[PDB]
Swiss-Prot record, chains A, B:
Highest taxon above the source species: Bacteria
Keyword Transport tagged: yes
Listed GO CC annotations: periplasmic space
Protein name, per record: Cytochrome c'
Binding site for heme c: R12, Q13, D67, C116, C119, H120
Lineage: Bacteria, Pseudomonadati, Pseudomonadota, Betaproteobacteria, Burkholderiales
GO biological process, one term: electron transport chain
Positions of modified residues (Pyrrolidone carboxylic acid): Q1
Length: 127, 127
């Protein structure tokens, strides 16, 4: 869907920006600093689930650019493992949110965050 | 979920960027220049549906900025009518996509596009 590589870059950066907001806005809830409304969080994690599937298709071959490391394309199977693992961590968060289980939510949230960081450590250039 | 107005601006611009991609990538399909796979389009319009609900919450009061016109906030009921109407046009597109009906899809796509433009004409500053 991208006329030039720059369009892919813009897409993925936007997708990741939205993910970051949908993930990060729950931080006060998991910390107890904001109240836990099970329905609010269920709906939000549904949005996060949708969004968390989107960036990967915008790292198609030849879409080098932005702060993407070239290892994304050298190493296809390893990058795919990291995104698929990340999406599976999102599944655990969805399960927690759907159950209305705050303890499972906290645990899953931590694991998701670790997965974001593991990918960045391997595949995102320093700012 | 926004620490400063700039964060709201960044969010909505990203949401609208993703909408534009999910909408616009169907143009060749509705024109017949690319093949119509009913399942592909159904899935894509589901993503568009999710995305099309997101920008509006990021025009909360005091989040002036970007290319948003101030009339968004003077005139709340009129802006809300335009976004809700737009989302209802997305419902028609969803119905068409879910039915696998290409003629309804074409018609709905046109109406959606007109709705994007009607909002821009009233509420988005010139580049
Ligand atoms: C690889 C499997 C990743 C996972 C999982 C997550 N992120 Fe990431 N992120 C990744 C890359 C390769 C990049 C660079 C993209 C580019 O082309 O520049 C990013 C970037 C971000 C950004 C910055 C986006 C921008 O505005 O330019 C953000 C805010 C971000 N990532 C957040 C984020 C969060 C919160 C994640 C888990 C919920 C997450 N990322 C996972 C690669 C990967
Ligand atoms: C009002 C009810 C709108 C509807 C419906 C649509 N758009 Fe829009 N758009 C609107 C505003 C007020 C702005 C400015 C946002 C800001 O703070 O700057 C925009 C902007 C866009 C953009 C640019 C985003 C960016 O990268 O800065 C795009 C690509 C865009 N809009 C596309 C778009 C499409 C394709 C729409 C229908 C499917 C659509 N918009 C509807 C207001 C409104």
């Amino acid at each position: 869907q991208f006329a030039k590589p720059e369009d892919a870059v813009k897409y993925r950066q936007s997708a990741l920006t939205l993910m970051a907001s949908h993930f990060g806005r729950m931080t006060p809830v998991v910390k107890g600093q904001a109240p836990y409304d099970a329905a609010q969080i269920k709906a939000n994690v549904e949005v996060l689930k949708t969004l968390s599937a989107l960036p990967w298709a915008a790292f198609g071959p030849g879409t080098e650019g932005g702060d993407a490391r070239p290892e994304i394309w050298s190493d296809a199977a390893s990058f795919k493992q990291k995104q698929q693992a990340f999406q599976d961590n999102i599944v655990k968060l969805s399960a927690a949110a759907d159950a209305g289980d705050l303890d499972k939510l906290r645990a899953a949230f931590g694991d998701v965050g670790a997965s974001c960081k593991a990918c960045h450590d391997a595949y995102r250039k320093k700012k």
